[PDB]
């Protein structure tokens, strides 16, 4: 077991109030003798799943609720079991964001939404519409100033515009069959952003650091940022307001709402100290004030302390923008949707891809997991039982049908030609229950990993998976077919993601074996 016992390590993002969090760790250490280390590593949302998976990493991880469903799906988080007394101290909707398969997987800390931030000295009336920002930039450019600068490297900041005229991630429970990443509304919003860049009103290269510096030295009239950014603006002496985001096509910008949440590592031998630090030290008037004094949290989940901060108009603007937005879903494929949209916005902005090209590729990566499982689960199940699934694939399922048709035709030959080799490998792997199926996964990455990438090898993997599903059903282990399909899908899309999207995904597969 790698994680040290008798002490707490905390991971929190570098835009957050980590010095304030460390003051609450000092107060925990002063009362219990347990040293709390707070770190803010780069890409901790990428690195937590990698190190947690091997029993390593921090005791507590802080991030918006959107990444927590994937970590729970991978068994990287402890179940949070606060009593009714502690649960009543926080807003029920904040608890809704940290509930996954009916289990609390984290402690909610604060509701974050993007607002529009403007220089009252340059722009006494901020724009009501996105459409008027070009004329405003022209006007401010004559004065050696610019209208707007925000981070174009993170899809988070651009999403409100993309979602305004009907863009969305998963239709709402959440329908992961229904992805709205390349709909007319999404094209309209992202096209308007590329047009601002084309007409020199914004810069494709602008990241968080550049946008913050330009706003805080009064070079740009406007930025798009969250509560965490107010501290640095306070220091900079800029007379700023926090207001409702400008509308697009007469409709509000819908910011993706995040709930800063604290998760407990499953591998942690200090889960009792972590529960005690989070419930009785951090989630208190004194604890949330210590963190908020460093960098504002936004609208905190703690009712007592949220009553006080509600009077602040910048919080009111945050909640107004939050109402017009959507609570982010916490489902496992959020990570793949964010990765896909990040790439789409960066490519459309730089002109490497068109808005049509970029958003189509992001709609493929957003659907790739569910689309792959649908094909593999149906193939494995129909091979095991001898009867096809009657149910319809759905509205976007023309690809799944042709891909299953191609897999049937192409992959039945592979089962026949490799029968002897498959039987040899299935005998040598002693499969017999869900436990034995857990083993297999480890094998398949090792095998599917260090080899040349082609549709031929993808077919062999799925074909051997069907062969194992046939065996599973034969020994009354038919319930293990759905998890084996999940594991084959997991190996394939987690390791070949970038290749599968370059091949137009399953359309590429049908195209490749067409005759
Ligand atoms: C967990 C087992 C998997 S998963 C997977 N995914 C893609 N390809 C595989 O094997 C082929 C090579 C090959 C040559 C002749 C017969 C079968 C396959 C390859 O790597 O190209 C495999 C194998 C695998 C590897 C070695 C073997 O001897 C057997 Cl029987 C198998 C089933
Ligand atoms: O940009 C995609 C990104 O969006 C959100 O991350 C936000 C985070 O929620 C905020 O707390 C803030 O600090 O900035 C981040 C933007 O870089 C999602 O939470 C995150 O999962 C996703 O990758």
UniProtKB/Swiss-Prot annotation:
Gene3D superfamilies reported in the protein's UniProt record: Periplasmic binding protein-like II
Entry keyword annotation includes Transport: yes
Entry keyword set: Periplasm, Signal, Sugar transport, Transport
Compartment annotation: Periplasm
GO biological process, one term: maltodextrin transmembrane transport
Pfam families from the UniProt entry: SBP_bac_1
Any GO molecular function: carbohydrate transmembrane transporter activity
GO CC annotation terms, alphabetical: ATP-binding cassette (ABC) transporter complex, substrate-binding subunit-containing; outer membrane-bounded periplasmic space
Function: Part of the ABC transporter complex MalEFGK involved in maltose/maltodextrin import. Binds maltose and higher maltodextrins.
Family recorded in the similarity comment: Belongs to the bacterial solute-binding protein 1 family.
Subunit architecture: The complex is composed of two ATP-binding proteins (MalK), two transmembrane proteins (MalG and MalF) and a solute-binding protein (MalE).
Protein name, as recorded: Maltose/maltodextrin-binding periplasmic protein
Source organism per UniProt: Escherichia coli O157:H7
Gene name, Swiss-Prot/TrEMBL: malE
């Amino acid at each position: 077991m790698k994680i040290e016992e008798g002490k707490l390590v905390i991971w929190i993002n570098g835009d957050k109030g980590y010095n304030g969090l460390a003051e609450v760790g000092k107060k925990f250490e002063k009362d219990t003798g347990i040293k709390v280390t707070v770190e803010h590593p780069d890409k901790l949302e990428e690195k937590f799943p990698q190190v947690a998976a091997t029993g390593d990493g921090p005791d507590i991880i802080f991030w918006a609720h959107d990444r927590f469903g994937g970590y729970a799906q991978s068994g990287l988080l402890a179940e949070i079991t606060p009593d009714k007394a502690f649960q009543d101290k926080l807003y029920p909707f904040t608890w809704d964001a940290v509930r996954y398969n009916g289990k609390l997987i984290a402690y909610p800390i604060a509701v974050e939404a993007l607002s529009l931030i403007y220089n009252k000295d340059l722009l006494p009336n901020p724009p009501k519409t996105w459409e008027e920002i070009p004329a405003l930039d022209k006007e401010l450019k004559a004065k050696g100033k610019s209208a707007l600068m925000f981070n174009l490297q993170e899809p988070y900041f651009t999403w409100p515009l993309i979602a305004a005229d009907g863009g969305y991630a998963f239709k709402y429970k959440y329908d992961i069959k229904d992805v709205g990443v390349d709909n007319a509304g999404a094209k309209a919003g992202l096209t308007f952003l590329v047009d601002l860049i084309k007409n020199k009103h914004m810069n494709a290269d602008t990241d968080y650091s550049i946008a913050e510096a330009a706003f805080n030295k009064g070079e740009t009239a406007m930025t798009i940022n969250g509560p965490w950014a107010w501290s640095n603006i306070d220091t900079s002496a800029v007379n700023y307001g926090v207001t409702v985001l400008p509308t697009f096509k007469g409709q509000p910008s819908k910011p993706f709402v995040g709930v800063l949440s604290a998760g407990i590592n499953a591998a942690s031998p200090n889960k009792e100290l972590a529960k005690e630090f989070l419930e009785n030290y951090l989630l208190t008037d004194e604890g949330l004030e210590a963190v908020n004094k460093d960098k504002p949290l936004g609208a905190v989940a703690l009712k007592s302390y949220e009553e006080e901060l509600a009077k602040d108009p910048r919080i009111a603007a945050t909640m107004e923008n939050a109402q017009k937005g959507e609570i982010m879903p916490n489902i496992p494929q959020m990570s793949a949707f964010w990765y896909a949209v990040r790439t789409a916005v960066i490519n459309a902005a730089s002109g490497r891809q068109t808005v049509d090209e970029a958003l189509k590729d992001a709609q493929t990566g957003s659907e790739l997991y569910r689309q792959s499982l649908e094909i593999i689960s149906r193939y494995l199940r129909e091979q095991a039982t001898g009867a096809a699934d009657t149910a319809p694939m759905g509205a976007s399922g023309a690809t799944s049908r042709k891909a299953l048709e191609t897999l049937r035709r192409v992959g039945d030959g592979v089962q026949r030609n490799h029968e002897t080799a498959f039987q040899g490998m299935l005998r040598k792997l002693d499969i017999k229950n869900e436990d034995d199926v857990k083993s297999l996964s480890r094998v398949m990455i090792h095998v599917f990993s260090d080899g040349v990438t082609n549709w031929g090898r993808i077919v062999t993997l799925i074909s051997f998976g069907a062969f194992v599903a046939k065996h599973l059903k034969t020994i009354n282990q038919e319930s293990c077919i759905e998890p084996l399909a999940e594991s084959i899908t997991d190996v394939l899309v987690r390791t070949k993601r970038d290749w599968l999207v370059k091949q137009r995904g399953w359309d590429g597969f049908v195209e490749f074996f067409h005759v």
